[PDB]
Each structure stands twice: as C-alpha cells, then as structure tokens.
Design a protein around this ligand. Structure first.
Ligand SMILES: C[C@H]1CN(C2COC2)CCN1c1ccc(Nc2cc(-c3ccnc(N4CCn5c(cc6c5CC(C)(C)C6)C4=O)c3CO)cn(C)c2=O)nc1
Ligand SMILES: [Zn+2]
Length: 429
C-alpha cells in the first residue's frame, strides 16, 4: 500500500527514428517506488488500465524543456488569461527521456518539486542535461544522435528540481541512534520508509545556521563516490535537521581500532586512496575540509571510506574548538603555519591528510602519544615529526612524510598524492 504522492492528467508524448510523434492524455501516478501513467475514462471520470511505468531509482534528472518553436493549437500558451498542455517537463532515465506536458505552470512546478523530493537520494543523479527536445533522431540543443548522450548544459541543481533542498520531516522515520558529535545527536532513519539516511539534529546554539543554509546550496551539488552526500535540510522546526548519506560501519577511527578486522596492508592503502580521491575532488572545486582526520571519516557496509563533515568547521560556535589553544582544537592534525598564524589553505589539508595516513597505518593510534596538545604545538614547529608505522613500508611512509614539509609550497597536491598512492598500488601489489 504505497502512498500516492500526486495525481494529475497530463499529455504524454510517444517515445520514438522515422516514426510519427503522437500525443495522448494520461493519468500519472507518483509514488516513492514508481512513476506510472494510465489511460483515463473521461466520461466516467475513472482511471483506466496501466500503459507504462518508470523506476524511481532509475531516474537521473527532472527539469523543464524549451517549448517548441511552432507548436500545434493544443500545446500553445493561451492568448487570454483539460484542453491545453503548453508547459512541458522531462524525466530522464535509461530508456531515453520522457516528455510530459502540463496545462498550467504551477502544476508543472509541483511535479518537478515532488519528483526531485523522490529522486534526490538516487546515486545516478546527473549534473548535465539536454535543455531541448529530442526530435528527428537528434537533440535540438546538442544535435547528438543518442537519447543516452551526455547532457549538453549544466543543471542549476544536481538532478534538476527547477528552497530546493527542503526535506519535509513528516516522511522521516527515526530507527536507531548513531551517537553524538559537535552539533548534537545523529540518528539512522529512512525517508518514506525506503531510502536509508542519517539525520543530523543540530543543537540550538551550536551552529551558525543562517551561514550554513547558504552553503548547503553548494554542498548539495557536490557529489563523489568517496564523499558523504548531503541530501537536504529541515529548517522549519526546532532543532533543524541535516539529511545526509548513511554509513553503516560508522567512524573510521573506531573502525581502525577494532583489532578483530585484522586488516591487510592492501586494505589500509585502499583507505588512503578513498580519502585522497575525495580530497582531490574537493580540491578541484576550491573546497577545503579544514578538519581532515580519521575521526571525521566514515565507512559504509562495503568497507569503503568516505570523507564527511567537510567545510563544517566554519560554522562551529564553540570557541573551545575554534581557538587555536582550545581543549577541543585539533592541534595534532594542524600544520605549523596554522597553529602559528592561522594560515589555512589546501596545503594545511595536505598536512592533515598525511597524519590521516599515519592513523590508518597505525590502526587508530593517537599521534604524538607522549606529547600533550601544547607540547605538540611547540615541538612540531621545531621539527617534531611522526615516526614510520610498523605496517607502513618505506615507500608508503615517503608519501605521508612528504605532507609534513616546513614550507607549505613544498608539500604535494592531492592530485600528486593520488598518483603516488596509485603507483605504490601498482608496484607493491
Ligand atoms: C557502527 C555502529 C556500531 N553501533 C554499535 C553496535 O551496537 C552499537 C553503534 C552505531 N555505530 C554507527 C553506525 C553508523 C554510523 N554512521 C554515521 C555516523 C555519523 C555521526 C554520528 C555522531 N557524530 C558524528 N560527528 C563527528 C564528526 N563531526 C560532526 C560534526 C562536526 C564534526 C567535525 C566538525 C568539528 C568539523 C563538525 C558529527 O556529527 C557523526 C558524523 O557526522 C554521521 N553519518 C552520516 C553516519 O552515517 N556511525 C556509527
Ligand atoms: Zn544536449
């Protein structure tokens, strides 16, 4: 008994090369599972038989379509403010694009919104799309001769949807606790009892909410297989929620400290590759993490590590964590220029990444265990560096050691570190 999210009568266009285009009226049903269209008995006002359906999980984008240059009377905007259907929108999926015409502009805006609410958790959401129709075996925007051609224009939002990231909490279900972080409790749940999600309940007074909500517009569009995805936010309540991807195995630091796993060195290097891939992607987007550490990484059910809580440090209101000398400040992961002058940059993240590799190959051991936070800050500025873990070969140690140079300009980039890791994987394996 799946809930029907919407119910409307649309003008569905047939999906073809030399075949004729036919438009027919259909009743579309939208659920969390499928998007189906039926025949409609208008005289009896009754839904007819089913003529087709599309898997929700297979939809990659929903957006409007540039109207036709010379449409027929049935699909023209009226000259004077279920007969007319002059407002089209497209649903992109493997089986080419489905084109649906709406009678009113407001109705089209409601379906694109609800459709996005239903596909925002899909893993195949695209960042490009064809803003024009597909006619004569070709696209009118790019002239590609394949319905599965890569999008020719950039979408304003990942997966379409034209805020757009406002998830309604009535469809969320809390099922299990996941602990507490800097912003409060985090729980495991499902959206419409289907898509697994993690719900971050932000304690009031712990986050600069207004500043983050402005950045969530950009973080939502960031997507990488090794990056914990941000789905949306719930900001019409107290406290607000942040819906993100769910990671079953949890924190990486704890994951490394369970001696039962008995990791192989190949597994440890794969963890470094996963993180490096995510940082390289953030590096390409001018995005900084500012707090890279094993504690801030997560592991999924398949043992894949993903970077999480990237850029969230700029909104922490706790001074004990923001101040360079606060008890919560990550002194043991900060570069000398950060502790001395607060000079943050991509190279400061490279330093933390080198410490992250040291944590992975040390199986969650605290760095500079014999030193306190104050003792570490004074000694790392003099030349104190972490030793080579026992499970780390000399070549692997050379990679993490290169991240700890005195001059930030002398440290490698995430693009070079990935090449170094991929090189070791190809030789030491
Ligand atoms: C593995 C099982 C084991 N289980 C035992 C077995 O019986 C009990 C307990 C549960 N446990 C478990 C399972 C799954 C998960 N998954 C998730 C955890 C978290 C999570 C939870 C609590 N605190 C945090 N942190 C920690 C980091 N951080 C936070 C906010 C900020 C930071 C850094 C900052 C200062 C920049 C700001 C922050 O919120 C996080 C990471 O976001 C987030 N996401 C998306 C998840 O998917 N975690 C734990
Ligand atoms: Zn195109």
């Amino acid at each position: 008994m799946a809930a029907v999210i919407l119910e409307s009568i649309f003008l569905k266009r047939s999906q073809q090369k030399t075949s004729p285009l036919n438009f027919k009226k259909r009743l579309f049903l939208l659920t969390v599972h499928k998007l189906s269209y039926y025949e409609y008995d208008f005289e009896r006002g009754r839904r007819g038989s089913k003529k087709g359906s599309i898997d929700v999980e297979k939809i990659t984008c929903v957006e409007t379509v540039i109207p036709e240059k010379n449409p027929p009377p049935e699909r023209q905007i009226p000259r004077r403010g279920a007969e007319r259907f002059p407002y089209p929108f497209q649903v992109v999926y493997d089986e080419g694009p489905l084109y649906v015409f709406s009678p009113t502009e407001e109705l089209r805006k409601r379906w694109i919104h609800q459709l996005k609410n239903v596909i925002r958790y899909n893993s195949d959401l695209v960042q490009k799309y064809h803003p024009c129709f597909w006619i004569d075996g070709q696209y009118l925007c790019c002239s590609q001769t394949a319905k599965n051609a890569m999008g020719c224009q950039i979408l304003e939002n990942r997966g379409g949807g034209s805020g757009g990231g406002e998830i309604d909490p009535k469809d969320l279900t809390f099922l299990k606790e996941l602990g507490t972080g800097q912003f409060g409790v985090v729980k495991y749940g499902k959206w419409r009892g289907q898509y697994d999600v993690a719900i971050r309940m932000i304690r009031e007074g712990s986050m600069s909410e207004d500043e983050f909500i402005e950045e969530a517009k950009v973080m939502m569009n960031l997507s990488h297989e090794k990056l914990v995805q941000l789905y949306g936010v719930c900001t019409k309540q107290r406290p607000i929620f942040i819906i993100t991807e769910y990671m079953a195995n949890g924190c990486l630091l704890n994951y490394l400290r369970e001696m039962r796993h008995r990791f192989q060195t190949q597994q440890l290097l794969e963890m470094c590759k996963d993180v490096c891939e995510a940082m390289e992607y953030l590096e390409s987007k001018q995005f900084l993490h500012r707090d890279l550490a094993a504690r801030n990484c997560l592991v999924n059910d398949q043992g894949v590590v993903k970077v999480s809580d990237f850029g969230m440090t700029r909104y922490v209101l706790d001074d004990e964590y923001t101040s360079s000398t606060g008890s919560k400040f990550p002194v043991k992961w900060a570069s000398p220029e950060v502790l001395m002058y607060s000079k943050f940059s991509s190279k400061s993240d490279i330093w933390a990444f080198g410490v992250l590799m040291w944590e992975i190959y040390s199986l969650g051991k605290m760095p500079y265990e014999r030193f306190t936070n104050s003792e570490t800050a004074e000694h790392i500025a003099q030349g104190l560096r972490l030793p080579r873990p026992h499970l780390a070969s000399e070549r692997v140690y050379t990679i993490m050691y290169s991240c700890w140079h005195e001059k930030a300009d002398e440290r490698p980039s995430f693009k070079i570190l990935l090449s170094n890791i991929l090189d070791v994987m190809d030789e030491e394996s």
